[PDB]
Amino acid sequence: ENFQKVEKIGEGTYGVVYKARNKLTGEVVALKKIRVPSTAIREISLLKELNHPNIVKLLDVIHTENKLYLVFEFLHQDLKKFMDASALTGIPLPLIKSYLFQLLQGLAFCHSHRVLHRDLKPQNLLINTEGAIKLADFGLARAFGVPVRTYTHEVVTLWYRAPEILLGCKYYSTAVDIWSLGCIFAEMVTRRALFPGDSEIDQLFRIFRTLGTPDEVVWPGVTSMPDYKPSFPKWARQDFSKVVPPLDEDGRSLLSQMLHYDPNKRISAKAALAHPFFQDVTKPVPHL
Ligand SMILES: *CCC(=O)N1CCN(C(=O)OC)c2ccccc21
């Protein structure tokens, strides 16, 4: 009872999440109960030191009884809510640019420490009313796995999953997080998810109908992926110009690099921060 419940924030991947108050310090936190493997201990331990202004701070890790409780900094809204609330008008392009720039800085930090997110999605991007955005749950996938359904049976979304994961490669490189952020960038710009698949094969075929069915020219090695089938239909690639209007040419070039099929060709977070799309980046104050 170090922490008093204030209210239920929601249902997470791994257990319930409460906004809570630290009895001694007076601080308000998001307290996640994780529903314990030595993988999970040593991973979580690394994560308490992986601190950066665009990563939601892991304040503490309590391991008591059967359970693991992670205590995080509290932020008041997620990007999924902010996008739904911005549906009529869209998030303004300078704010989209500022958020992408801040998220790439969070990714560049984590990846320089060899830690991946692996399940980036709008629900895991948290914003404050000052203009910042931060990545939540970084590292939890390697600690705990990414399940097919959550503890309350909700389906974990596939919409932001990289194609190498969907084709059954079990080696995750930092490129998986660049793909997910590219999908979120496209969703902020057009106000619709880019590849809203509802099964692994629907997700792959939505990817292939936009970017073309991958072959050994664009992705050497693809036909040796565990789940690759020579019988996948062959779709032609569309132009980006049709996929994310009214994004300008620099943003379309950057998106295209974040969505290359071969993880080895996909742009890194450090290289993305240098892209001319960010020449004019600013830090606007958002409408909440
Ligand atoms: C899933 C393991 C892996 O890293 N692969 C799959 C095979 N592959 C490759 O070149 O095999 C001849 C490949 C190519 C690009 C990215 C990942 C992988």
Residue numbers in the entry: 2 to 36, 44 to 296
Authors' description from the paper:
We chose to target Cdk2, which is a clinically important protein in oncology, the activity of which is important for driving cell replication and is dependent upon association with a cyclin protein. Although Cdk2 possesses three cysteine residues, numerous Cdk2 crystal structures show that only one (C177) is surface‐exposed. Cys177 on Cdk2(WT) is positioned adjacent to the cyclin‐binding interface, and we next investigated whether covalent modification of this site could affect the holoenzyme's activity. Moreover, we have shown how covalent modification of a unique cysteine residue can enable allosteric modulation of Cdk2 activity with unprecedented selectivity.
Among the fragments that showed accelerated reactivity with Cdk2(WT), acrylamide 1 (REF=5.0) was further investigated because of its impressive proteinaceous selectivity profile. Intact protein mass spectrometry confirmed that acrylamide 1 mono‐modifies Cdk2(WT), even in the presence of millimolar glutathione, while Cdk2(C177A) was unaffected. Interestingly, Cdk2(WT) completely modified with acrylamide 1 exhibited about 83 % inhibition of kinase activity. Crystallization of 1‐Cdk2(WT) showed that the acrylamide had labeled Cys177 with the ligand bound into a shallow pocket adjacent to the cyclin‐binding interface, interacting with Trp227 and Met233. Although 1‐Cdk2(WT) showed only minor structural deviations from Cdk2(WT) in the region surrounding the ligand, significant distortion was observed around the αC‐helix. The αC‐helix is essential for proper formation of the active Cdk2‐cyclin complex and its displacement is implicit in allosteric modulation of various kinases. Interestingly, while crystallization of 2‐Cdk2(WT) revealed that acrylamides 1 and 2 adopt similar binding conformations, the representative structure from the MD trajectory of 1‐Cdk2(WT) is closer to Cdk2(WT) at the αC‐helix, with only a modest change in global flexibility. Indeed, acrylamide 1 failed to inhibit Cdk1‐cyclin A2 in vitro after prolonged exposure (24 hours).
